[PDB]
Design a protein around this ligand. Sequence first.
Ligand SMILES: *[C@@H]1O[C@H](CO)[C@@H](O[C@@H]2O[C@H](CO)[C@@H](O)[C@H](O)[C@H]2NC(C)=O)[C@H](O)[C@H]1NC(C)=O
Ligand SMILES: *[C@@H]1O[C@H](CO)[C@@H](O)[C@H](O)[C@H]1NC(C)=O
Ligand SMILES: *[C@@H]1O[C@H](CO)[C@@H](O)[C@H](O)[C@H]1NC(C)=O
Ligand SMILES: [Cu+2]
Ligand SMILES: [Cu+2]
Ligand SMILES: [Cu+2]
Ligand SMILES: [Cu+2]
Ligand SMILES: [Zn+2]
Ligand SMILES: [Zn+2]
Length: 497
Amino acid sequence: AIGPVADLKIVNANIQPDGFTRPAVLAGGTFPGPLIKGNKGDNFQLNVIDELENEDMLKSTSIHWHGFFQHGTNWADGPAFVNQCPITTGHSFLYNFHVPDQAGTFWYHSHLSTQYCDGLRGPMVVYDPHDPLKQLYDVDDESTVMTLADWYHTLARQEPPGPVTPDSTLINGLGRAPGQTTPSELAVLTVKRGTRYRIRLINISCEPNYHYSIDNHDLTVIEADGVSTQSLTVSSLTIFAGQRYSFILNANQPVGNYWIRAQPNDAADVTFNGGINSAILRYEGAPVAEPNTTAGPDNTPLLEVNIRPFVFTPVPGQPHAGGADFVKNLLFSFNGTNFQVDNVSFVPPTVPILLQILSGAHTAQDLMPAGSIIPLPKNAVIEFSMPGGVVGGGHPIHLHGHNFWVIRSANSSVYNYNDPVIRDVVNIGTTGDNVTIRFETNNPGPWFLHCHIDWHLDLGFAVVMAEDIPDAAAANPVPAAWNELCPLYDALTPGNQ
Ligand SMILES: *[C@@H]1O[C@H](CO)[C@@H](O[C@@H]2O[C@H](CO)[C@@H](O)[C@H](O)[C@H]2NC(C)=O)[C@H](O)[C@H]1NC(C)=O
Ligand SMILES: *[C@@H]1O[C@H](CO)[C@@H](O)[C@H](O)[C@H]1NC(C)=O
Ligand SMILES: *[C@@H]1O[C@H](CO)[C@@H](O)[C@H](O)[C@H]1NC(C)=O
Ligand SMILES: [Cu+2]
Ligand SMILES: [Cu+2]
Ligand SMILES: [Cu+2]
Ligand SMILES: [Cu+2]
Ligand SMILES: [Zn+2]
Ligand SMILES: [Zn+2]
């Protein structure tokens, strides 16, 4: 692991995580990137050093620390042309921020175009030495972070028009693609019999959700997207792009090898044929062999409606629909080629939105592209409904700068104004669903809200929450290096970008 103070080199390398060799964009030269870590309260100083040379996957980059509120450090959030210009190759940029009020499972990823799909994504954990769930498990460390990643044999920027589908699922960086004549290497999570582990499960994919289970073991879910939850023991869960769950794995079964199953909603092959979409849970002492186990009846799946925060955390505003200061029904649509939010497809501006603000924008209405701006008042309760229906999912919608109470989840008619889950990525489901969330505006600056299916983001599925803009410049003082980003980036030719 690295951090809270570390360099992060961003490099090109050729890899074959599912047996197929291809070039990639890799944090620390590995897929996934190294685990970045710290304790609650730490100052992260992550010096991102861009050494990219392959134009096909972009040589510039920009990193976002997914789920961190970045209060007073909006400039370190990462989204290209919202919070910064991309870092240029041959240069570095220091993301310098604190995590005073969060402890949980997070991750980091490129937030420039579709680059994270090409490999730049890794896990990031903020440990709590006073974690109230500490007494539920024995081991919680780098070995217990588990990433679920889609993987594509075509480079992201070379993907043809229309729906993109992954070639394989990589668990902790390995997995099999369909069609192999000799099976490639499976990831192995090794466990000691009688030991309880906190598995920190992260879906770092560009697209699929995974129906996840472990043969012969139940999962006791204790965290969702950074926020500790009441324990809920389940037979499987479904985890969308960008979401996290911690669960307790109790290694209480006989010594053996057990299949960890991560079944993507969409991919070249969604089955477990040939041990694809799988990894191995190996008890110490078990043979170096594949599991021979089978999945159970799956009678108690995790349902988002059932997840409750560990610390009771009431819903702000009044406990009825529209009971908040600013209330908006977000209309997501697809026009045949592009996504739109409230009839506008996101087009990144040449001047990043925070630079527009520091250059003198008085308010949200000065910001461009104006059609993608939602002004939010300061110190208020916000309620967004986001009815499902637009093609492509199953859309995991994510808000930057905030997490939110999920009043109403997909596939549920329930409005919970009492003790809904708090998270930062939520599936909006499909036509008939009306996921509804609330959050509070205690964080001035421009914050992205977007679908976390990266292909949909590229096709414009995004809007900017322009929060307390009159205070945003003063609330987010920037370092000199951040002022040099746009001059360096704009000096490049198209395309040496
Ligand atoms: C999703 O929920 C929103 C919020 O309740 C619904 O929009 C509201 O609908 C009521 C009932 O017609 C109106 O009186 C409100 O003015 C609307 N609120 C807002 C902020 O627009 C919306 O209709 C629901 N959509 C679906 C598809 O169920
Ligand atoms: C859809 O919207 C995009 C983005 O505004 C526009 O350029 C495109 O031509 C539209 N496609 C169709 C089929 O209208
Ligand atoms: C909705 O939930 C029910 C019961 O919890 C489940 O059986 C069903 O498969 C779900 N429906 C959809 C459309 O996802
Ligand atoms: Cu993200
Ligand atoms: Cu994020
Ligand atoms: Cu989407
Ligand atoms: Cu994002
Ligand atoms: Zn492919
Ligand atoms: Zn103005």
